[PDB]
Amino acid sequence: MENFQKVEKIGEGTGVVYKARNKLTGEVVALKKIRTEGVPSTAIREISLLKELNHPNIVKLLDVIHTENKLYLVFEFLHQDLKKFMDASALTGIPLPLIKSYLFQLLQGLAFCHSHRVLHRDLKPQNLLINTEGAIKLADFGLARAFGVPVRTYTHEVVTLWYRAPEILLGCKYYSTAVDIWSLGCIFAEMVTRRALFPGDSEIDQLFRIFRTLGTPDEVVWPGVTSMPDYKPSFPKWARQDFSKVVPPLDEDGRSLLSQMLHYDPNKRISAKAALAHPFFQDVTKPVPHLRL
Ligand SMILES: NC(=O)c1cc([N+](=O)[O-])c(NCCN2CCNCC2)cc1NCc1cnc(N)nc1
């Protein structure tokens, strides 16, 4: 509209996203255009609810605009995402104190969302935004299940499966808060090793990469797994690997927490609230990151 002044095009989110300035307030925001034969009225209501979900580690949804039947989401603006920061820190690696601070903050954000019955469902480094003060915030939220499993964006883009929990890959129709803990565990491992934990290039390659590392799940470690929608008795049976080999040289406090975030059974997987109490965070601090904007 005329209330906004486009500053630049940020990219092609999971719709198009622009950095824009509000002429009235003068505030700089991120404007996402969501492209469809009437724009569901059940969604606009669900979205409108997220406007009240405020927390320091959650990107604020400032406004929802339906006018013109285009549907625009206005978000608070942050300059960089964790994916770019990790690439920039590839040579030296993000310092452990900062990795710990970020993980701690993200768990606080998840604990808040989960206590308000809000799930993210599509956590990935590109959806974690950071600023110069050392803060990190959860963004996007997959649009509150508005768009289920997006195979291609408005211009056909390859959906990342790297952070998908095993129960989703096995066809479970009801996601629980545990899917977000799994994704965050994968991100924690990636910050530590500087390599994606499970970089699959297809749904089955994703599932098999998980099995090759954590062992093919069975009824002992995951009661009910063999009855899941897409489970096949023909899956190969791989033995589990030790975490000392998976995320070296992370210490035992870190390995212990990661192991709990990656349990196969969603019911055994640690909650965000419980993870905040883990010994790994006894010495947590809030360092300032080296950001080049
Ligand atoms: N709230 C925001 O400031 C913000 C919002 C969105 N968004 O989507 O509304 C966004 N898009 C990222 C698109 N992806 C998410 C889905 N997986 C692929 C990556 C980026 C943002 N900021 C960080 C940033 C700023 N500037 C440049 N150039 N790059 C990044």
From Swiss-Prot:
Matching SUPFAM superfamilies: Protein kinase-like (PK-like)
Catalytic activities: L-seryl-[protein] + ATP = O-phospho-L-seryl-[protein] + ADP + H(+); L-threonyl-[protein] + ATP = O-phospho-L-threonyl-[protein] + ADP + H(+)
UniProt entry tagged with the keyword Phosphoprotein: yes
Ligand binding (ATP): 10-17, 32, 76-78, 81, 124-127, 140
Modification type N6-acetyllysine: residues: K6
Keywords assigned: Acetylation, ATP-binding, Cell cycle, Cell division, Cytoplasm, Cytoskeleton, DNA damage, DNA repair, Endosome, Kinase, Magnesium, Meiosis, Metal-binding, Mitosis, Nucleotide-binding, Nucleus, Phosphoprotein, S-nitrosylation, Serine/threonine-protein kinase, Transferase
Chain positions recorded as Mg(2+) binding sites: N127, D140
Chief site of localization: cytoplasm
N-acetylmethionine modified-residue sites: M1
Protein kinase domain: residues covered: 4-281
The organism's place on the tree of life at top rank: Eukaryota
Protein's cellular compartments: Cytoplasm, Cytoskeleton, Microtubule organizing center, Centrosome; Nucleus, Cajal body; Cytoplasm; Endosome
Phosphothreonine sites (modified residues): T14, T155
Cofactor(s) the record lists: Mg(2+)
UniProt EC number: 2.7.11.22
GO BP terms, alphabetized: cell division; cellular response to nitric oxide; cellular senescence; centriole replication; centrosome duplication; chromatin remodeling; DNA repair; DNA replication
Active site per the UniProt annotation: D122 (proton acceptor)
Subunit structure as annotated in this protein's UniProt entry: Found in a complex with CABLES1, CCNA1 and CCNE1. Interacts with CABLES1. Interacts with UHRF2. Part of a complex consisting of UHRF2, CDK2 and CCNE1. Interacts with the Speedy/Ringo proteins SPDYA and SPDYC. Interaction with SPDYA promotes kinase activation via a conformation change that alleviates obstruction of the substrate-binding cleft by the T-loop. Found in a complex with both SPDYA and CDKN1B/KIP1. Binds to RB1 and CDK7.
Role summary: Serine/threonine-protein kinase involved in the control of the cell cycle; essential for meiosis, but dispensable for mitosis. Phosphorylates CABLES1, CTNNB1, CDK2AP2, ERCC6, NBN, USP37, p53/TP53, NPM1, CDK7, RB1, BRCA2, MYC, NPAT, EZH2. Triggers duplication of centrosomes and DNA.
Family: Belongs to the protein kinase superfamily. CMGC Ser/Thr protein kinase family. CDC2/CDKX subfamily.
Record's protein name: Cyclin-dependent kinase 2
Taxonomic lineage: Eukaryota, Metazoa, Chordata, Craniata, Vertebrata
Gene name of the encoded protein: CDK2
